[PDB]
Amino acid sequence: MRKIGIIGGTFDPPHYGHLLIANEVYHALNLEEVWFLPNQIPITSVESRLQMLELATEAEEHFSICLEELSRKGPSYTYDTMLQLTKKYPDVQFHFIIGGDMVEYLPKWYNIEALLDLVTFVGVARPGYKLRTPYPITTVEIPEFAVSSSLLRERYKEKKTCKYLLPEKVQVYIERNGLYE
Amino acid sequence: MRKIGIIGGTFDPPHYGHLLIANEVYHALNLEEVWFLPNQNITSVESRLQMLELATEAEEHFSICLEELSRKGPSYTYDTMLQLTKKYPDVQFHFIIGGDMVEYLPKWYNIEALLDLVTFVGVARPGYKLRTPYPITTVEIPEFAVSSSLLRERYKEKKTCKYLLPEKVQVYIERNGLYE
Ligand SMILES: [K+]
Ligand SMILES: [K+]
């Protein structure tokens, strides 16, 4: 029933690439909410990541943090996570957001066909682009913003500018607490 | 000799793509300033200049250059840079272009004389090397595929533009009813 977007990631740190995708999909598909789902890490503390995530999202009631993947140590197969969430929120239609580059590879995901019954995949395409896939997925066109957590971590380490890449508030948190040096 | 960046465009509207590039090049090459150089139903010059102002008001080292606007009709880059080098003889101009454009430099009007007037700065995606016969500087910048025309289309379709251009510029747009 209720349409909720899911966006996974390390959020280490969270950045404007996350916010942009969350906002676009939120509007394109007319979602009720978008949940940011912090993954485990393949190191910044979990608390630090959640506080940055909180600062990143504090300004929009429709963005929320989901801790499911954290109540269990080690890597989670997306299927396990989504199984738990559908179990917990039976009246929610989950929209699992993925990059268009990822769409090609979906057949390689653990338990992909059972996973397809749990969620609606949303692929992010560059404007003007059609995604090629055997599976029935939704496409949302979004200008490419090639920023990533790891790129930002490098930069902070090299004392290089990050202006415009992640929220001013998260930057302050980072500098204040001396993350990524 | 002062190092000044030049970034050309319609700025119709100006957006975070512009600011991002300007900031990256400013820091990468340790420039003194970056000048935004506006090109010549169409938005008024004054509207464009005003948005450009709002977009850049917060950084003393971003400035607006009116050279191309002071000549009615379009201006080859060579003509513009010739004028600027005349007026600012002690400036080393860093003309900023997209990596995709680097391929097509040999096709520019008077490219060879132009090379003596400016240092080209090509914007590359991280990890990629630009291929060109000419001696240019490379700055790596994460791709932000936003453009004025994309934004104009978005506004006409009453579609969200959050995170794509500065709030001050959005507000300006909604208040002067631009792009509907
Ligand atoms: K919130
Ligand atoms: K300024």
Side-chain angles (χ1 to χ4, degrees):
Chain A
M1 189 70 66
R2 300 163 39 211
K3 291 157 151 189
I4 310 272
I6 300 287
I7 174 175
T10 62
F11 303 104
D12 185 25
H15 52 65
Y16 273 125
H18 298 124
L19 296 174
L20 174 58
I21 288 158
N23 185 249
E24 296 282 330
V25 179
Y26 172 75
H27 287 289
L29 305 189
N30 195 38
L31 303 174
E32 161 182 329
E33 298 194 85
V34 177
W35 295 356
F36 294 70
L37 186 76
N39 311 331
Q40 296 289 37
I41 292 184
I43 291 178
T44 303
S45 76
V46 165
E47 265 154 24
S48 286
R49 296 193 283 128
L50 299 174
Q51 280 176 16
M52 289 187 292
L53 203 40
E54 180 56 38
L55 292 163
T57 54
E58 65 179 17
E60 24 277 311
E61 290 200 272
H62 57 96
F63 291 173
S64 300
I65 303 170
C66 182
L67 309 162
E68 191 60 31
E69 283 217 352
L70 295 187
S71 66
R72 300 164 148 184
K73 195 101 72 176
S76 296
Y77 299 117
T78 300
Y79 176 76
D80 300 331
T81 309
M82 295 319 306
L83 189 53
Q84 279 315 299
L85 292 182
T86 53
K87 276 186 191 168
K88 297 186 178 204
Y89 307 94
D91 67 321
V92 169
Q93 183 195 2
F94 288 98
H95 294 65
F96 200 89
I97 300 161
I98 61 170
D101 292 342
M102 170 70 69
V103 169
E104 158 193 358
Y105 316 118
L106 283 175
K108 268 145 189 167
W109 286 29
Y110 174 69
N111 221 356
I112 175 63
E113 327 219 275
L115 178 49
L116 283 157
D117 297 338
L118 299 181
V119 309
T120 304
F121 283 104
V122 183
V124 172
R126 292 169 169 179
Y129 261 99
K130 297 168 196 162
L131 297 167
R132 305 269 284 107
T133 177
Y135 306 119
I137 80 174
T138 306
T139 293
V140 176
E141 295 188 358
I142 310 184
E144 187 181 3
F145 197 3
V147 47
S148 65
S149 296
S150 64
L151 163 69
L152 290 170
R153 295 193 305 269
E154 283 179 60
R155 252 139 110 106
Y156 275 109
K157 194 189 183 180
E158 305 171 6
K159 285 218 176 303
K160 188 177 168 177
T161 183
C162 293
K163 192 173 181 203
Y164 304 117
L165 301 184
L166 69 172
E168 165 64 8
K169 283 169 191 171
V170 168
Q171 295 181 231
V172 160
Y173 183 91
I174 287 165
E175 292 150 27
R176 178 71 204 138
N177 288 109
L179 296 184
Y180 315 129
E181 308 184 328
Chain B
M1 284 296 269
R2 24 210 306 256
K3 292 160 150 186
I4 310 271
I6 301 284
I7 175 180
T10 61
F11 302 102
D12 186 24
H15 53 69
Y16 277 123
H18 296 125
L19 300 177
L20 175 59
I21 286 157
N23 184 246
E24 296 283 326
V25 176
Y26 169 74
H27 286 289
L29 307 189
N30 195 36
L31 303 176
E32 177 174 348
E33 296 194 89
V34 175
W35 296 356
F36 294 71
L37 184 77
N39 287 327
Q40 295 264 41
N41 273 1
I42 295 178
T43 301
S44 80
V45 165
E46 193 52 68
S47 285
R48 294 197 280 134
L49 282 184
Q50 292 214 355
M51 288 187 292
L52 198 39
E53 181 54 39
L54 290 165
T56 58
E57 63 178 18
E59 24 277 312
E60 289 200 271
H61 55 281
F62 287 175
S63 296
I64 302 171
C65 182
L66 310 164
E67 191 57 34
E68 295 207 338
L69 292 179
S70 303
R71 272 202 202 160
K72 276 235 172 309
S75 298
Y76 286 117
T77 298
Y78 175 75
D79 300 329
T80 305
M81 296 317 302
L82 187 53
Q83 280 315 300
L84 292 182
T85 53
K86 286 175 180 185
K87 295 193 191 186
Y88 308 93
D90 278 336
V91 169
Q92 183 194 2
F93 290 99
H94 294 63
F95 201 90
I96 298 161
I97 58 171
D100 289 343
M101 170 70 71
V102 171
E103 169 174 356
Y104 312 125
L105 286 174
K107 268 147 187 166
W108 288 28
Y109 175 70
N110 223 353
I111 176 61
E112 62 290 345
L114 178 48
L115 284 157
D116 297 337
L117 300 180
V118 308
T119 301
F120 282 105
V121 180
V123 173
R125 292 166 172 180
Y128 171 69
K129 296 164 194 163
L130 299 166
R131 305 268 284 107
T132 177
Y134 307 121
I136 79 174
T137 306
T138 294
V139 177
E140 298 190 353
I141 308 185
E143 189 181 3
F144 197 2
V146 46
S147 62
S148 297
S149 66
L150 163 67
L151 290 173
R152 288 196 305 271
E153 165 170 310
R154 264 184 156 50
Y155 274 112
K156 192 186 185 183
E157 306 172 6
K158 299 188 185 188
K159 189 176 168 179
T160 186
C161 286
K162 194 174 180 197
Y163 303 117
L164 300 182
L165 69 174
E167 272 170 69
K168 284 206 164 190
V169 173
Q170 296 180 229
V171 161
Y172 182 94
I173 290 168
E174 292 147 28
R175 277 179 90 227
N176 292 92
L178 297 183
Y179 317 124
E180 277 115 48

